[PDB]
Amino acid sequence: DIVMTQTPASVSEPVGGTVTINCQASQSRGNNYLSWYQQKPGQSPSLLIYRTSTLASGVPSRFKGSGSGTQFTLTISDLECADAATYYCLYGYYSSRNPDFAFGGGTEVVVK
Amino acid sequence: AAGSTMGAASMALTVQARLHMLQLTVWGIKQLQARVLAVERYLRDQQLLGIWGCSGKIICCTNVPWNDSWSNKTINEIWDNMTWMQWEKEIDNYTQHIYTLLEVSQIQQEKNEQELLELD
Amino acid sequence: AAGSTMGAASMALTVQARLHMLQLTVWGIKQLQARVLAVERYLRDQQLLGIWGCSGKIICCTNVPWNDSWSNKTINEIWDNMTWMQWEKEIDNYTQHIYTLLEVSQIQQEKNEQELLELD
Amino acid sequence: AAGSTMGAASMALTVQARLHMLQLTVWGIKQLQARVLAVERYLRDQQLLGIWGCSGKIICCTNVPWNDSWSNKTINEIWDNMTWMQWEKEIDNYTQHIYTLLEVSQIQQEKNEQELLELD
Amino acid sequence: AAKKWVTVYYGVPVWKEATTTLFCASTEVHNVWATHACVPTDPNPQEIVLGNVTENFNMWKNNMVEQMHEDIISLWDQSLKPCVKLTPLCVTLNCNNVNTNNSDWEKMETGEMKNCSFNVTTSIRDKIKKEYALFYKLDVVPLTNYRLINCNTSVITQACPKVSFEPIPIHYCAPAGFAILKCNSKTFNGSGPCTNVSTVQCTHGIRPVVSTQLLLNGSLAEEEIVIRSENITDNAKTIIVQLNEAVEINCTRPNNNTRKSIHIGPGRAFYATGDIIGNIRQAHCNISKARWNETLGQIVAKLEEQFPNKTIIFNHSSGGDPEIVTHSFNCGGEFFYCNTTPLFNSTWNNTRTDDYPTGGEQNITLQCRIKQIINMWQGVGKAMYAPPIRGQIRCSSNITGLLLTRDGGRDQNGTETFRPGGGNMRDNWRSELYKYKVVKIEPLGIAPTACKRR
Amino acid sequence: NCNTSVITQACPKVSFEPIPIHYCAPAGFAILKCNSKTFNGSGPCTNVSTVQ
Amino acid sequence: LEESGGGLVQPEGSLTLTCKASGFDFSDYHVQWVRQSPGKGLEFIGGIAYTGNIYYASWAKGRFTISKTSSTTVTLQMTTLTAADTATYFCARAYGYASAPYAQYFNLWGPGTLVTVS
Ligand SMILES: *[C@@H]1O[C@H](CO)[C@@H](O[C@@H]2O[C@H](CO)[C@@H](O[C@@H]3O[C@H](CO)[C@@H](O)[C@H](O[C@H]4O[C@H](CO)[C@@H](O)[C@H](O)[C@@H]4O)[C@@H]3O)[C@H](O)[C@H]2NC(C)=O)[C@H](O)[C@H]1NC(C)=O
Ligand SMILES: *[C@@H]1O[C@H](CO)[C@@H](O[C@@H]2O[C@H](CO)[C@@H](O[C@@H]3O[C@H](CO)[C@@H](O)[C@H](O)[C@@H]3O)[C@H](O)[C@H]2NC(C)=O)[C@H](O)[C@H]1NC(C)=O
Ligand SMILES: *[C@@H]1O[C@H](CO)[C@@H](O[C@@H]2O[C@H](CO)[C@@H](O)[C@H](O)[C@H]2NC(C)=O)[C@H](O)[C@H]1NC(C)=O
Ligand SMILES: *[C@@H]1O[C@H](CO)[C@@H](O[C@@H]2O[C@H](CO)[C@@H](O)[C@H](O)[C@H]2NC(C)=O)[C@H](O)[C@H]1NC(C)=O
Ligand SMILES: *[C@@H]1O[C@H](CO)[C@@H](O[C@@H]2O[C@H](CO)[C@@H](O)[C@H](O)[C@H]2NC(C)=O)[C@H](O)[C@H]1NC(C)=O
Ligand SMILES: *[C@@H]1O[C@H](CO)[C@@H](O[C@@H]2O[C@H](CO)[C@@H](O)[C@H](O)[C@H]2NC(C)=O)[C@H](O)[C@H]1NC(C)=O
Ligand SMILES: *[C@@H]1O[C@H](CO)[C@@H](O[C@@H]2O[C@H](CO)[C@@H](O)[C@H](O)[C@H]2NC(C)=O)[C@H](O)[C@H]1NC(C)=O
Ligand SMILES: *[C@@H]1O[C@H](CO)[C@@H](O[C@@H]2O[C@H](CO)[C@@H](O)[C@H](O)[C@H]2NC(C)=O)[C@H](O)[C@H]1NC(C)=O
Ligand SMILES: *[C@@H]1O[C@H](CO)[C@@H](O[C@@H]2O[C@H](CO)[C@@H](O)[C@H](O)[C@H]2NC(C)=O)[C@H](O)[C@H]1NC(C)=O
Ligand SMILES: *[C@@H]1O[C@H](CO)[C@@H](O[C@@H]2O[C@H](CO)[C@@H](O)[C@H](O)[C@H]2NC(C)=O)[C@H](O)[C@H]1NC(C)=O
Ligand SMILES: *[C@@H]1O[C@H](CO)[C@@H](O[C@@H]2O[C@H](CO)[C@@H](O)[C@H](O)[C@H]2NC(C)=O)[C@H](O)[C@H]1NC(C)=O
Ligand SMILES: *[C@@H]1O[C@H](CO)[C@@H](O[C@@H]2O[C@H](CO)[C@@H](O)[C@H](O)[C@H]2NC(C)=O)[C@H](O)[C@H]1NC(C)=O
Ligand SMILES: *[C@@H]1O[C@H](CO)[C@@H](O[C@@H]2O[C@H](CO)[C@@H](O)[C@H](O)[C@H]2NC(C)=O)[C@H](O)[C@H]1NC(C)=O
Ligand SMILES: *[C@@H]1O[C@H](CO)[C@@H](O[C@@H]2O[C@H](CO)[C@@H](O)[C@H](O)[C@H]2NC(C)=O)[C@H](O)[C@H]1NC(C)=O
Ligand SMILES: *[C@@H]1O[C@H](CO)[C@@H](O)[C@H](O)[C@H]1NC(C)=O
Ligand SMILES: *[C@@H]1O[C@H](CO)[C@@H](O)[C@H](O)[C@H]1NC(C)=O
Ligand SMILES: *[C@@H]1O[C@H](CO)[C@@H](O)[C@H](O)[C@H]1NC(C)=O
Ligand SMILES: *[C@@H]1O[C@H](CO)[C@@H](O)[C@H](O)[C@H]1NC(C)=O
Ligand SMILES: *[C@@H]1O[C@H](CO)[C@@H](O)[C@H](O)[C@H]1NC(C)=O
Ligand SMILES: *[C@@H]1O[C@H](CO)[C@@H](O)[C@H](O)[C@H]1NC(C)=O
Ligand SMILES: *[C@@H]1O[C@H](CO)[C@@H](O)[C@H](O)[C@H]1NC(C)=O
Ligand SMILES: *[C@@H]1O[C@H](CO)[C@@H](O)[C@H](O)[C@H]1NC(C)=O
Ligand SMILES: *[C@@H]1O[C@H](CO)[C@@H](O)[C@H](O)[C@H]1NC(C)=O
Ligand SMILES: *[C@@H]1O[C@H](CO)[C@@H](O)[C@H](O)[C@H]1NC(C)=O
Ligand SMILES: *[C@@H]1O[C@H](CO)[C@@H](O)[C@H](O)[C@H]1NC(C)=O
Ligand SMILES: *[C@@H]1O[C@H](CO)[C@@H](O)[C@H](O)[C@H]1NC(C)=O
Ligand SMILES: *[C@@H]1O[C@H](CO)[C@@H](O)[C@H](O)[C@H]1NC(C)=O
Ligand SMILES: *[C@@H]1O[C@H](CO)[C@@H](O)[C@H](O)[C@H]1NC(C)=O
Ligand SMILES: *[C@@H]1O[C@H](CO)[C@@H](O)[C@H](O)[C@H]1NC(C)=O
């Protein structure tokens, strides 16, 4: 399997600042197999990023994704309190033999 | 019996109703002309019927009297006891007079009078 | 809902309604054929509607009964709960029978009976 | 006076109503284009009138109100005391709006409401 | 409670598959593919989305491809018709070599560019003059005496030297009464059922690009690389690989090649290669190594699923005439034939590319040759002579896809071999028109009602 | 002009005599003409008539 | 998309949850199941390919069955449940592609269904 690790956890920054999330995953098969989700407490997660470097429609110019094999980062350019959420990093590879799906544990980001 | 009264010989019927790349070859050019011509002939008749207010008709009734100078024979002498080809020859010289009358006033006035009646 | 009842998928709509010198070049010949063909297809449909007395109609009402051998389903089984493409396939073998009935008597008799009524 | 009211200069009249082998020669190709084009222009007008339910009309009456944003002049300011060419220029920017209104609902609803009324 | 009656509906949304004649839609360069005869396109070609419909598409049975094939041939020809036929040049050529030894590695000429003299009848029929021209090795054959290649058995016509061959997108448009359906499904793969269907009066523009091995300037896959085939198992079919990212290819013909005008008849001017100012060099193309490596890594993952466990082997063409077994493209009238051995250089395990050693090399080079006498479609249409175009020619293009074939598929060692093969140019156009189907509209329909006519 | 061009002999049966040619508009079109004595080839014209 | 069929189940009992394609026909889409227990992130359960191929997570270990039962209807069966399996279960969509590997990013997430064991 693939094991995804996320850090830092329990992130808390002042409103108007910036945040980055560091994600690790072994055996990457490329940067096109990784995505990010934004989950606010009480709801379903929503697609934020769908390719390491590409954001989902409706997503503002923050949450820029970047990375290289096994090394992924999400950057929040503007900590509006509207974005306080738990962010998840997802990896998967549909395959007839090796689906390889994994999520990290999520990173809580608090905007004060 | 509208199609049977005007002579027994009404059997031409409607063969005209029965009726790949456009390569400009010896036969191909002729095929093109045939298609273009079929359209032109169809429209000339349809346009004239449209002008007279007979566009949707097989037989259209009008408000223009027979006149009787064209032919002074009666209904049972013209409509019956006669073949359509003979008839068209008998009144051939009045074709334009009649067509003019079928449009002038008959469609033009009829429609302008309706325009006035429809204002009420 | 006449255009919505016969399946949700009625969205082909009317792309057919949406639709320099005639040089006979490689592309030019094809352009000519496209124009000639568009005219021919338009007229074939318009002429048939004209024959049935449906020339000015979107939907025309007739005096010919459904028969029910073509399809014995009811209005809420055919008109509703069905897509137009499925329907045309279901009664495809009756196309000529129905077209014949739409003209024969339905336009021909209707007009001859009117000719007689209009003599009064 | 429908053709006389809209300016004295209504004298263009209907020259458009007044209007051998297809050899593809220098003059012959041009003759072909002229015939094909005459058909296309005729049909574009006839089809539009057909859509509005004005196929057999010279003047057709509709159920769509004048709106008055297009022009707020009255009948004796527009219909009379004006030439048709001036008029077409005055409301040129509303051509598509008006054509859309002449079809939408005006023919479409009118026919669907009749379909319902004819079920009784 | 009521009788059913027959009613007629006009504007009924139904259709049937049909094949018809399509017309095209779109500076005094007389472009041959996109002539002034094209109608302009609609600035707002609104697409109509269909509802819950399905349709069956098959790119391998698509008559639009066949119709395009014939149009490209007819446009190539005709455009070249009112030009000089060069028959008078089919005479003995007395040829020798040129001195290429004027450190230009990867750019050196080796025994090509022959200096030929010939006896040609001048514009005056009783006068003969000796003329000189340089020829590419691939344009002549020995009988040292030489003749122009393909003179025997064919007529080589000089393109009129004002006419451009630059591809310009051409849109295909249905005649009114017809429409083109397109499959937008992400799962389509060129065949079978499609649930996301929409329709247009006209297709998107397609550049009438002619090439071999690599498909240039076509569309990219929307998101992920798609491998299409009529049949995966059948090694005789072409496998079309559509990339979701382009790979840049940059080609140069770095010579100051100045042309010469020779009168061989009454208004019939032959445009000769003239001579070279400066140091003569061979043509070449460069691609980015990193991009090629990423592209092939993704392609092997996809081919490996189709052919699991087995070793992926890429190889060079099988060998044969360097007209059809090499890469081919056209930049401004210069026809390039390039050696792609370095692109299909090797084999590897898993989906991990290998045998491309890490080093300072950034640009993979392909050595190229130039031909003036060419044969698009081999035996269909006429041979054409490409005038020289005054030197320093540079161009670049987007590799959008590859044409691969399987090398027999009889290797008993647990391997599969792919080569940059392919068939007729139909394969190139098929790869772009794959999503379209032509249907006819039949707006008059019949249904039961409860109304009755008075 | 032999050099640079092809000189073609007219077929010796063909006449070049000018014969009046009328230009005709396709139906749906018309040709307007200015009959003003003051026209001079340009600008406004008040005496206007039309022909096919 | 919406899920259904949650509620309380006893120890070692079972549930079947149903995800409905309310205007989102699963014809070219993959349907996947995930789980999120209280205070946790997301675990992956498995899913159905547009092709009909059914795959499972190492998280399920055979305790879950994934099946397309009709067009528009996908269900998740779960058995021999314990306290640790209390979670909100969700269905989500991913695009299918005409290919071999697929990115499978999620979209069209449903609201989720609570399953509790006690
Ligand atoms: C893939 O697409 C690319 C572009 O996206 C395309 O490359 C382009 O090719 C055209 C070929 O015509 C180049 O245009 C030439 O540019 C040079 C620049 O100096 C001009 O001198 C050329 O002029 C010729 O045409 C003139 C017309 O009057 C003549 O007067 C003159 O004497 C020349 O004959 C011409 O404009 C264009 O610049 C490139 N684009 C780039 C960015 O380089 C490529 O060819 C396509 N791929 C394939 C396989 O076709
Ligand atoms: C296409 O690819 C070839 C092959 O790489 C390119 O030629 C290479 O160009 C580089 C850059 O000039 C040369 O590297 C260095 O150049 C400097 C210039 O002063 C020199 O001082 C260094 O010692 C070194 O040579 C490289 O050597 C050269 N390769 C060869 C075989 O000569 C070419 O430029 C590329 N360009 C295009 C347009 O396709
Ligand atoms: C090809 O051959 C011709 C003649 O054999 C070369 O042209 C000669 O160039 C020299 C240079 O000084 C002149 O002095 C001669 O008078 C030229 N001869 C003629 C007939 O013009 C031409 O340069 C050769 N090309 C190459 C590449 O070697
Ligand atoms: C072009 O014509 C010349 C003569 O006008 C040819 O040169 C002669 O070739 C014959 C062949 O035996 C020799 O015997 C003569 O001595 C040559 N004359 C000269 C002046 O050299 C020449 O070979 C022809 N070239 C080609 C390519 O046909
Ligand atoms: C189903 O079809 C619709 C229409 O073909 C697709 O809608 C497109 O969605 C993309 C998303 O950015 C837009 O950019 C396009 O402009 C839309 N098309 C049109 C005509 O507006 C939809 O994406 C298709 N669904 C799938 C799964 O392919
Ligand atoms: C391209 O798509 C077609 C259509 O989905 C694939 O053909 C199917 O292949 C499966 C393999 O078991 C068959 O069970 C289906 O019945 C086939 N469908 C039809 C309509 O025949 C084809 O294999 C796909 N190509 C690739 C490379 O996957
Ligand atoms: C080859 O690919 C490049 C990008 O990889 C294309 O460049 C883009 O072209 C579009 C055209 O509108 C521009 O809007 C983008 O901004 C360009 N990208 C960049 C990075 O500048 C190029 O046009 C492609 N060539 C062909 C023939 O498709
Ligand atoms: C795709 O190509 C393969 C290869 O030819 C076809 O499979 C062969 O079918 C014939 C039928 O007689 C068998 O004798 C061969 O043994 C089969 N080959 C293999 C490797 O099994 C296959 O049927 C083609 N697919 C389609 C849809 O036509
Ligand atoms: C082909 O040429 C293009 C430009 O002519 C090269 O693209 C440039 O690449 C550099 C690399 O840093 C960029 O900084 C430039 O901005 C790019 N230019 C443009 C216009 O995008 C391209 O890399 C060359 N490709 C090859 C294989 O040589
Ligand atoms: C790439 O293709 C070449 C050409 O077919 C292969 O080389 C041949 O290998 C066979 C193996 O027995 C020899 O018998 C032939 O004589 C070789 N041909 C030549 C021209 O030497 C080569 O092995 C292929 N590449 C791979 C990885 O298999
Ligand atoms: C393409 O280039 C390769 C070299 O890059 C040519 O193959 C070489 O041919 C020479 C001839 O002696 C051999 O000594 C080399 O070992 C060969 N190298 C390789 C990699 O095989 C090849 O023939 C050229 N092909 C074409 C079509 O021009
Ligand atoms: C194809 O394989 C050959 C080796 O089999 C590669 O040749 C090497 O290329 C590097 C590039 O600088 C040189 O430094 C080595 O010295 C070359 N090795 C030999 C034996 O000559 C060749 O580059 C490969 N093609 C590609 C595109 O990588
Ligand atoms: C104004 O126009 C009318 C019509 O164009 C002109 O009438 C012409 O008058 C001459 C006088 O002999 C007649 O021979 C022509 O036959 C008339 N034309 C027509 C069509 O019948 C009138 O002359 C023009 N007025 C001016 C001042 O030019
Ligand atoms: C031909 O007629 C035109 C139109 O009447 C004349 O142009 C006018 O010239 C006067 C000279 O002052 C200007 O004031 C007008 O404004 C011009 N009219 C237009 C419409 O521009 C033209 O000069 C006449 N030619 C001759 C030789 O008199
Ligand atoms: C027929 O119409 C013409 C029109 O001038 C009229 O003069 C003639 O007297 C009419 N004939 C009869 C018999 O009334
Ligand atoms: C019609 O009038 C002519 C005038 O001579 C006459 O000879 C002819 O017999 C008349 N026909 C009828 C049917 O009265
Ligand atoms: C038809 O006209 C002729 C004229 O001689 C007459 O003899 C014959 O009886 C007429 N026929 C009928 C059916 O009136
Ligand atoms: C007028 O009509 C009669 C009908 O028989 C015909 O014989 C005569 O030749 C016609 N005259 C002209 C000038 O057409
Ligand atoms: C339909 O019309 C045909 C015409 O022959 C008739 O035989 C048939 O019985 C009719 N069908 C029904 C169900 O009445
Ligand atoms: C129509 O008649 C056929 C005859 O077998 C019958 O099977 C079918 O169920 C009938 N359909 C309806 C709607 O009654
Ligand atoms: C008759 O109509 C039915 C309707 O489904 C169709 O299935 C059948 O193939 C048709 N038969 C013929 C001969 O057209
Ligand atoms: C004309 O129709 C438009 C349609 O939106 C409407 O907004 C406008 O107010 C109408 N004009 C008048 C004067 O009623
Ligand atoms: C129409 O409305 C405009 C708005 O300014 C006004 O100026 C104009 O005089 C009005 N015309 C009429 C006929 O009322
Ligand atoms: C709108 O109509 C008026 C009427 O005179 C015209 O002057 C104006 O130029 C038109 N505007 C546009 C954009 O067509
Ligand atoms: C597809 O079918 C569903 C069934 O509920 C319907 O709601 C939907 O509107 C249909 N699609 C379209 C485009 O109407
Ligand atoms: C054309 O001439 C070349 C010269 O060698 C020869 O090899 C070739 O076979 C000839 N073509 C034919 C069809 O004989
Ligand atoms: C890949 O490497 C493994 C190492 O054990 C080997 O077993 C396998 O056969 C190799 N596969 C290929 C395609 O060479
Ligand atoms: C190709 O990409 C893979 C990805 O890991 C990399 O490991 C390998 O070194 C790359 N090869 C080249 C030649 O860049
Ligand atoms: C054609 O030949 C004549 C003969 O003197 C010459 O003057 C003229 O310049 C030649 N034409 C050209 C374009 O050289």
Choose among A29, A32, A96: nearest Cβ to E305: A96
Count other C-beta atoms under 10 Å from residue A87's C-beta: 25
| Residue F36 Cα: closest atom of ligand 13 | 28
Is the CB–ligand 11 distance for residue E328 below 6 Å?
A: no
What is the distance between the alpha carbons of residues D56 and A82, in angstroms, rounded to a whole number? 64
CB contacts of D33 in chain F (<8 Å) are: 26
Q: From the CA of D112, how many Å to the nearest CA of chain B?
A: 21
Q: Cis link prior to A8 (omega < 30° from 0)?
A: yes
Choose among C29, C40, C107: nearest Cβ to B39: C40
What is the distance between the alpha carbons of residues G1 and G91, in angstroms, rounded to a whole number? 8
What is the distance between the alpha carbons of residues E329 and E108, in angstroms, rounded to a whole number? 21
The answer to whether E298 contacts A30, with C-beta atoms less than 8 Å apart, is yes
C-alpha to C-alpha distances, C77 to C6, C71, C80, D115, E444, nearest whole angstrom: 10, 10, 6, 19, 21
Which of D33, D96, D115, D117 to mutate to test binding with chain E, by most E CBs within 10 Å of its CB? D115
Ligand 12 mutation pick, E286, E346, E363, max ligand atoms within 8 A of CB: E346
Note whether G46 and G64 are within 8 A (CB). yes
Per-state percent for chain A, helix, strand, coil, to nearest 5: 5, 50, 45
- The C-alpha angle B47, B52, B55, rounded to 5 degrees, equals 55
Note whether E115 and E93 are within 8 A (CB). no
CB contacts of A105 in chain G (<8 Å) are: 40-41
* D103, D106, D111, D112: CA torsion to nearest 10: 100
For residue E299, give the nearest of E247, E360, E231, E371 by alpha carbon.
Answer: E247
Q: How many domains does one find in chain A?
A: 1
Note whether E334 and E255 are within 8 A (CB). no
Choose among D2, D24, D42: nearest Cβ to B24: D24
User: Atom 6, ligand 15: which residue's CA is nearest?
Assistant: B67
Q: Which helix (H) or strand (E) holds B112?
A: helix B108-117
CB contacts of E123 in chain F (<8 Å) are: 2-4
The answer to whether D112 contacts C24, with C-beta atoms less than 8 Å apart, is no
Residue ranges making up the domain that contains A11:
1-112
The answer to whether F26 contacts D42, with C-beta atoms less than 8 Å apart, is no
C-alpha to C-alpha distances, E307 to C3, E204, E417, nearest whole angstrom: 49, 34, 11
C-alpha to C-alpha distances, F41 to F25, F37, F45, F51, nearest whole angstrom: 21, 10, 10, 18
Q: Would the CA dihedral through B60, B66, B71, B77 be positive or negative?
A: positive
The answer to whether F27 contacts D42, with C-beta atoms less than 8 Å apart, is yes
* CA B85 / ligand 15 centre spacing (Å): 24
Residue C2's φ and ψ, nearest 5 degrees, are -60, -35
Note whether E440 and E15 are within 8 A (CB). yes
CB contacts of E2 in chain D (<8 Å) are: 119
Which of E3, E12, E20, E41 to mutate to test binding with chain C, by most C CBs within 10 Å of its CB? E12
E-strand spans in chain B? none
Q: Is D37 on the interface with F (CB under 8 A)?
A: yes
Q: Give residue for tokens 């009249």.
A: D13
For residue C83, give the nearest of C12, C2, C16, C5 by alpha carbon.
Answer: C5
* CA E335 / ligand 11 centre spacing (Å): 21
| Burial class, F40, CB count within 10 angstroms (exposed 0-12 / middle 13-18 / buried 19+) | exposed
Strand pairing class (F48-51; A54-55)? unpaired
CB contacts of A96 in chain E (<8 Å) are: 305
Choose among E52, E195, E226: nearest Cβ to G28: E195
Integer Rg of chain D from CA: 19
By C-alpha distance, the chain B residue nearest C118 is: B61
* Region of D24 on the Ramachandran plot (φ > 0 left; ψ -120 to 50 alpha; else beta): beta
Q: Which chains touch C (3 or more CB pairs under 8 A)?
A: B, D, E
What is the distance between the alpha carbons of residues E116 and E47, in angstroms, rounded to a whole number? 58
E48 Cβ partners below 8 Å, 6+ apart?
A: C11, C12, C13, C15, E198, E199, E200
* CA F2 / ligand 29 centre spacing (Å): 9
* Residue B111, SS3 per DSSP: helix
Ligand 13 site residues, Cβ closer than 6 angstroms: F 35-37, 47, 49
* Region of E140 on the Ramachandran plot (φ > 0 left; ψ -120 to 50 alpha; else beta): beta
CB contacts of D34 in chain F (<8 Å) are: 24, 26-27
By C-alpha distance, the chain B residue nearest D39 is: B40
* Residue E401, SS3 per DSSP: strand
The answer to whether F52 contacts D19, with C-beta atoms less than 8 Å apart, is yes
Max CA separation in chain G (angstroms): 44
What is the distance between the alpha carbons of residues A1 and A3, in angstroms, rounded to a whole number? 6
* E48, E53, E54, E60: CA torsion to nearest 10: -20
If you count residue pairs, one on E and one on F, with CB atoms under 8 Å apart, how many are there?
A: 15
Method of determination?
Answer: cryo-EM
Which of A7, A88, A101 to mutate to test binding with chain G, by most G CBs within 10 Å of its CB? A101
**Is C touching E (3+ C-beta pairs, cut-off 8 A)?**
yes
Strand pairing class (A11-13; A107-111)? parallel
Ligand 26 mutation pick, E143, E152, E156, E375, max ligand atoms within 8 A of CB: E152
The answer to whether G103 contacts E224, with C-beta atoms less than 8 Å apart, is yes
E252 strand-pairing partners: E284, E394
Q: Which helix (H) or strand (E) holds G89?
A: strand G87-95
Any long-range contacts for A60-69 (C-beta under 8 Å, 24+ apart)?
A63/A36, A63/A38, A65/A36, A67/A23, A67/A31, A67/A34, A68/A31, A69/A28, A69/A30, A69/A31
What is the distance between the alpha carbons of residues D76 and D82, in angstroms, rounded to a whole number? 9
Any long-range contacts for C41-49 (C-beta under 8 Å, 24+ apart)?
C41/E175, C41/E176, C41/E177, C42/D43, C42/D47, C42/E176, C42/E177, C43/B39, C43/B42, C43/B43, C43/D43, C45/E10, C45/E443, C45/E444, C46/D50, C47/B42, C48/C99, C48/E444, C49/E8, C49/E10, C49/E444
How are strands ordered across the β-sheet holding E436-441? E15-17, E436-441, E178-183, E197-200, E48-49
For residue B47, give the nearest of D16, C114, D36, D34 by alpha carbon.
Answer: D16
Q: Would the CA dihedral through B16, B20, B22, B27 be positive or negative?
A: negative
* CA E385 / ligand 4 centre spacing (Å): 27
What is the distance between the alpha carbons of residues C111 and B57, in angstroms, rounded to a whole number? 8
Q: From the CA of D84, how many Å to the nearest CA of chain E?
A: 31
Is the CB–ligand 4 distance for residue E121 below 6 Å?
A: no
| Residue E398 Cα: closest atom of ligand 7 | 1
Identity of residue G43: E
Look up residue E139 and give its DSSP letter. G
| Burial class, G70, CB count within 10 angstroms (exposed 0-12 / middle 13-18 / buried 19+) | exposed
Is the CB–ligand 25 distance for residue C8 below 6 Å?
A: yes
**Is A touching F (3+ C-beta pairs, cut-off 8 A)?**
no
Tokens of residue E28, six digits: 């005094």
Any long-range contacts for C23-26 (C-beta under 8 Å, 24+ apart)?
C23/D29, C23/E37, C24/B24, C24/D24, C24/D29, C25/E35, C25/E37, C25/E78, C26/E35, C26/E37, C26/E71, C26/E74, C26/E75, C26/E78
For residue E226, give the nearest of E178, E180, E188, E170 by alpha carbon.
Answer: E188
* B96, B100, B101, B104: CA torsion to nearest 10: 180
Q: Would the CA dihedral through E343, E349, E351, E357 be positive or negative?
A: negative
CB contacts of C52 in chain B (<8 Å) are: none
Ligand nearest to the CA of B77: 17
* Residue E393, SS3 per DSSP: strand
Note whether A24 and A2 are within 8 A (CB). no
CB contacts of E449 in chain D (<8 Å) are: 115, 119
Note whether E246 and E268 are within 8 A (CB). no
For residue A36, give the nearest of A2, A76, A3 by alpha carbon.
Answer: A76
Helices (runs of H) and strands (runs of E) counted in chain D = 7, 0
Is the CB–ligand 19 distance for residue C4 below 6 Å?
A: no
E118 strand-pairing partners: E93, E131
Tokens of residue E340, six digits: 């792609």
What is the distance between the alpha carbons of residues C104 and E254, in angstroms, rounded to a whole number? 79
Choose among B40, B55, B107: nearest Cβ to D39: B40
